[PDB]
Amino acid sequence: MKTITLYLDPASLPALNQLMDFTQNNEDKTHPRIFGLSRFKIPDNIITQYQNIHFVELKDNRPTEALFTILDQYPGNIELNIHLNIAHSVQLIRPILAYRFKHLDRVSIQQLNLYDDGSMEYVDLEKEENKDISAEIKQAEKQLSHYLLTGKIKFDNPTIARYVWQSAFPVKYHFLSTDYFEKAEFLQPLKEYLAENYQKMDWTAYQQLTPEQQAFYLTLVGFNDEVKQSLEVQQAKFIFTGTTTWEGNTDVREYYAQQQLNLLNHFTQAEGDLFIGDHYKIYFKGHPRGGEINDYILNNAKNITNIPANISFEVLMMTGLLPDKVGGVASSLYFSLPKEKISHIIFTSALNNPYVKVMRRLGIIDESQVIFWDSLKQL
Numbered sequence: 001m002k003t004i005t006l007y008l009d010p011a012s013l014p015a016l017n018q019l020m021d022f023t024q025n026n027e028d029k030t031h032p033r034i035f036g037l038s039r040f041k042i043p044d045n046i047i048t049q050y051q052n053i054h055f056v057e058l059k060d061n062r063p064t065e066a067l068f069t070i071l072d073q074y075p076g077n078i079e080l081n082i083h084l085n086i087a088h089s090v091q092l093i094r095p096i097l098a099y100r101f102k103h104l105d106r107v108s109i110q111q112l113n114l115y116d117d118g119s120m121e122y123v124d125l126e127k128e129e130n131k132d133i134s135a136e137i138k139q140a141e142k143q144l145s146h147y148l149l150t151g152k153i154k155f156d157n158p159t160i161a162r163y164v165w166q167s168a169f170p171v172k173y174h175f176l177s178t179d180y181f182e183k184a185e186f187l188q189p190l191k192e193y194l195a196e197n198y199q200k201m202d203w204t205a206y207q208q209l210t211p212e213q214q215a216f217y218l219t220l221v222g223f224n225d226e227v228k229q230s231l232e233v234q235q236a237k238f239i240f241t242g243t244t245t246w247e248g249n250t251d252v253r254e255y256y257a258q259q260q261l262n263l264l265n266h267f268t269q270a271e272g273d274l275f276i277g278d279h280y281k282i283y284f285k286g287h288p289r290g291g292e293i294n295d296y297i298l299n300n301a302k303n304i305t306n307i308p309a310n311i312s313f314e315v316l317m318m319t320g321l322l323p324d325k326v327g328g329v330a331s332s333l334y335f336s337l338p339k340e341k342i343s344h345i346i347f348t349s350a351l352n353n354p355y356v357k358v359m360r361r362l363g364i365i366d367e368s369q370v371i372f373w374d375s376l377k378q379l
């Protein structure tokens, strides 16, 4: 009997947590590990310290069939310790279930550890506000059973389906907001169902690591001394945070880039609606997938210091390097930001906007008139 740990995430936030789990378990050099983290490359000089370390691409939110070749190397009874993105859990586990079916006598699922993609889970949950949540859970459990028995995916409620894994496996959920499950009264049956199977994402985990593990972790997430030194400047700091679009449409991507540059100007120019003051040093923390939208800010802004877009914002909180003020388009990063540091959060374009509702529920935004980015004069 042998445990194999899989770390799967096409996004950022679950991978960030999973790399913490790997760091905590980094003394064990031989434990079989499969990394399917789209946004993170484990440095070679770390890879070389480990045996039984494997890598798999994700395509369409699941491990490719390359997974099967890796698993074939382990010919005995194997138990899978699987780490997943919640929003994408059903697809990510699909090839794992298919492999289990082919080797039903030797392959088992030990447990699941699941982490929020980010704001998406909460925006999705907000849309379920008028449903009988208790009934949705019971139906999702039944349809999960069919998935597990047949390999066929069919959920009447794809959103609630993300939360019923306990009906089949030992599970632990790691939520960006545990407050949401307390504050959204319509979700009470889900809170109660999830019982003792969840905790909040622990942003104090880094602080409890040894100095050696802290250095190891920072190497995994792409943090380095130069970014550290850039943020240790003796001046008040403002970080402008970027967003992205998943649309490939040039019109849409150019629109996003232009509108986001205009937003930055509203923060940093004296005439801007959101003017922060002349004494701040300005940084840009682009979205990890901003791509040319990121480039547009760096090319068209002035006196801005880039924080490499691949560095997740929450690392600055872990390292105690948060700036005085943070502003930009609504992002998952605002879910764990101390409220005193929020300048303004801007929504893309509506009181009943589900993202607005989520943040209002959570006390991240107040009762004032929300700001959409197309409400801003082109400066």
Ligand SMILES: CC(=O)N[C@@H]1[C@@H](O)[C@@H](F)[C@@](OP(=O)(O)OC[C@H]2O[C@@H](n3ccc(N)nc3=O)[C@H](O)[C@@H]2O)(C(=O)O)O[C@H]1[C@H](O)[C@H](O)CO
Pocket (backbone or CB within 6 Å): 011, 012, 013, 016, 117, 118, 119, 120, 121, 123, 241, 242, 243, 244, 245, 246, 285, 286, 287, 288, 289, 309, 311, 312, 313, 314, 330, 331, 332, 333
């Ligand atoms: C509602 C919805 O669809 N939410 C998804 C969200 O759950 C997740 F898929 C992600 O989350 P998103 O809120 O962008 O932020 C996710 C994480 O990326 C890092 N980050 C982000 C922005 C930034 N300027 N600096 C950073 O470092 C932080 O670690 C943060 O916690 C994502 O791509 O991972 O993208 C959004 C949207 O699809 C996207 O914003 C397009 O508008």
Ligand SMILES: OC[C@H]1O[C@@H](O[C@H]2[C@H](O)[C@@H](O)[C@@H](O)O[C@@H]2CO)[C@H](O)[C@@H](O)[C@H]1O
Pocket (backbone or CB within 6 Å): 010, 011, 012, 087, 088, 117, 120, 246, 289
């Ligand atoms: O990168 C992780 C995020 O992916 C989003 O899906 C995008 C995808 O990134 C993009 O390449 C293309 O395939 O369009 C998808 C949207 O339909 C997820 O929606 C988001 O939750 C993150 O997981």
